[PDB]
Amino acid sequence: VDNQFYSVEVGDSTFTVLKRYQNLKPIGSGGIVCAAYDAVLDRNVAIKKLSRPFQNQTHAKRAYRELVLMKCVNHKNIISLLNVFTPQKTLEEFQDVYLVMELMDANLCQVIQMELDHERMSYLLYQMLCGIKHLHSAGIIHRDLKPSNIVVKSDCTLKILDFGLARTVTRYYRAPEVILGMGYKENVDIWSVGCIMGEMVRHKILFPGRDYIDQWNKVIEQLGTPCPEFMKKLQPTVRNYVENRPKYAGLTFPKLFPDSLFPADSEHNKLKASQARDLLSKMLVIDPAKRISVDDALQHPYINVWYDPAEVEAPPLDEREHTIEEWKELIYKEVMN
Ligand SMILES: N[C@H]1CC[C@H](Nc2nccc(-c3cccnc3Oc3ccc(NS(=O)(=O)c4ccccc4)c4ccccc34)n2)CC1
What secondary structure does DSSP assign to 19-36, as a single string?
Answer: TTEEEEEEEE---EEEEE
CA atoms within 13 A on the CB side of 328: 15
> If phi over 0 gives left and psi between -120 and 50 gives alpha, with beta otherwise, what is residue 156?
left
261 touches 200 (CB < 8 A): no
Give me the catalytic one of 2, 12, 96, 144.
Answer: 144
CATH 3.30.200.20 intervals, the chain: 5-105
294 touches 189 (CB < 8 A): yes
147 touches 205 (CB < 8 A): no
Distance from the alpha carbon of residue 280 to the mean position of ligand 1, in angstroms: 28
The number of beta carbons lying within 10 Å of the beta carbon of residue 296 is: 13
For the domain made up of 106-313, give the CATH fold. Transferase(Phosphotransferase); domain 1 (1.10.510)
> What is d(CA 155, CA 160) in angstroms, rounded to the nearest whole number?
16
Query: Where is 114: in which H helix or E strand?
Result: none
Q: Which residues have C-beta within 8 Å of that of residue 196, sequence separation ≥ 6?
A: 108, 112, 128, 145, 146, 147, 150, 173
Structural method: X-ray
Helix pair 57-72, 324-336: axis angle to 10 deg? 30
In this structure, which amino acid lies at residue 224? G
Distance from the alpha carbon of residue 162 to the mean position of ligand 1, in angstroms: 9
In this structure, which amino acid lies at residue 75? H
Q: Which residues have C-beta within 8 Å of that of residue 337, sequence separation ≥ 6?
A: none
CATH 1.10.510.10 intervals, the chain: 106-313
In this structure, which amino acid lies at residue 92? E
Ligand 1 neighbours (beta carbon < 6 A): 27-28, 33, 46, 48, 62, 66, 79, 99, 101, 103-107, 151, 161-162
> What is d(CA 312, CA 317) in angstroms, rounded to the nearest whole number?
25
Query: Where is 311: in which H helix or E strand?
Result: helix 309-312
CA atoms within 13 A on the CB side of 233: 16
Helix pair 267-283, 118-137: axis angle to 10 deg? 30
Distance in Å from the first CA to the final CA of the chain? 17
Among the CATH numbers 3.40.50.720, 3.30.200.20, 3.40.640.10, 3.30.930.10, which is that of 5-105?
3.30.200.20
